[PDB]
Amino acid sequence: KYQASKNRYNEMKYSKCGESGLKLPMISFGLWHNFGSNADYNNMKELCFTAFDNGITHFDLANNYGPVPGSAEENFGRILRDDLATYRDELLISTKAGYKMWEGPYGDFGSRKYILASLDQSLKRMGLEYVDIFYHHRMDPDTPLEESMMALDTAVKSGKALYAGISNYNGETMEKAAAILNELKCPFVINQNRYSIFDRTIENNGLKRAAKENGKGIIAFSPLAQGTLTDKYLSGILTEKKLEQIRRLNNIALNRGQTLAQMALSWVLKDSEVTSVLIGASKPSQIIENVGIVHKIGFTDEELMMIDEISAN
Numbered sequence: 001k002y003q004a005s006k007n008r009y010n011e012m013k014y015s016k017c018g019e020s021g022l023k024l025p026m027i028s029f030g031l032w033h034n035f036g037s038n039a040d041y042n043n044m045k046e047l048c049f050t051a052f053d054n055g056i057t058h059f060d061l062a063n064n065y066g067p068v069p070g071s072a073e074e075n076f077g078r079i080l081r082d083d084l085a086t087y088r089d090e091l092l093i094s095t096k097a098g099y100k101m102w103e104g105p106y107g108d109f110g111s112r113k114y115i116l117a118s119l120d121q122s123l124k125r126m127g128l129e130y131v132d133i134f135y136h137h138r139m140d141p142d143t144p145l146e147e148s149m150m151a152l153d154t155a156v157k158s159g160k161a162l163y164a165g166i167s168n169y170n171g172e173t174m175e176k177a178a179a180i181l182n183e184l185k186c187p188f189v190i191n192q193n194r195y196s197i198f199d200r201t202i203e204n205n206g207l208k209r210a211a212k213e214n215g216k217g218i219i220a221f222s223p224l225a226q227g228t229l230t231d232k233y234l235s236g237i238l239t240e241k242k243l244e245q246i247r248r249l250n251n252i253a254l255n256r257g258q259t260l261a262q263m264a265l266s267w268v269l270k271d272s273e274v275t276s277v278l279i280g281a282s283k284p285s286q287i288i289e290n291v292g293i294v295h296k297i298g299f300t301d302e303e304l305m306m307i308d309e310i311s312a313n
């Protein structure tokens with residue numbers, strides 16, 4: 001019954017993952033929220049269909065997305081089986097292991113045991129032969145980096161992942177990971193990190209610069225900073241200081257013909273080293289509003305120095 005829009009590649013822009021021939025849509029769709037046990041199945045399908053119809057080819061999951069850890073993967077597995085499997089070779093599907101998935105010493109952090117056992121569970125829940133990208137979800141300083149990276153390499157060499165990625169790494173540790181995956185001859189093309197007007201962590205921990213200097217992509221998540229970079233906290237007449245930052249940023253957005261959310265998405269994409277911005281949605285209208293932003297990623301030196309002075313604590 002679902003037939004992907006014939007116009008789905010007409011507007012979206014696609015960007016190389018650093019030096020790689022792998023291209024992400026400039027807007028990627030994440031299943032962190034609204035795909036869990038309590039989610040409505042018809043709404044989840046419509047969100048996926050809306051995403052793909054607008055040229056979003058990348059669906060981002062993790063083992064523990066729900067809630068109930070694994071529910072998002074199982075739900076996406078059902079959407080694939082029922083309607084999207086037809087288009088599987090047009091989709092990039094990711095999953096991850098590295099945060100808490102199940103109880104006990106093998107269900108969190110980083111070991112080869114957890115990472116590989118988790119990937120098998122993810123493939124079973126999603127009904128896939130492989131994921132396009134398999135990520136180490138966060139750094140584990142208590143496991144040798146060589147062990148976690150060799151686990152990603154085993155995933156790729158076992159035909160269970162096309163490419164390796166890492167998430168939440170700093171610049172120094174990303175460099176070490178890149179060196180290990182290079183020596184293992186394991187495709188490694190993408191970093192997934194939190195980035196917004198209100199979260200400059202990757203500008204200060206070396207990740208944004210290390211990714212660019214080593215030809216690795218970046219996919220930015222939480223670009224709307226927990227609803228603070230949306231209309232949610234705006235009036236038409238939650239510290240007083242935060243509401244003021246939001247009021248002034250929204251004025252910069254209005255002058256650009258954008259909502260605050262739209263400008264927040266455009267800002268994360270302003271620099272070429274950021275490959276894609278990862279959005280969420282509860283309703284299709286949010287996808288449709290957000291996909292216009294890929295066409296306004298340019299900012300004047302004035303807009304930028306104002307956004308920085310306003311966002312500065």
Ligand SMILES: NC(=O)C1=CN([C@@H]2O[C@H](COP(=O)(O)OP(=O)(O)OC[C@H]3O[C@@H](n4cnc5c(N)ncnc54)[C@H](OP(=O)(O)O)[C@@H]3O)[C@@H](O)[C@H]2O)C=CC1
Pocket residue numbers: 029030031032033060061137167168192193220221222223224225226227230231261262278279280281282283286287289290
């Ligand atoms: N450690 C990691 O690697 C992590 C990665 N991620 C990835 O990033 C993805 C996105 O993260 P998330 O924080 O949800 O992303 P965003 O910062 O894009 O927030 C998404 C939410 O913002 C609201 N929203 C979206 N578009 C609009 C709009 N145009 N106007 C107003 N409100 C809007 C909706 O919430 P509502 O309708 O309820 O207001 C939506 O559910 C996740 O799904 C996941 O794939 C995220 C977290 C951790």
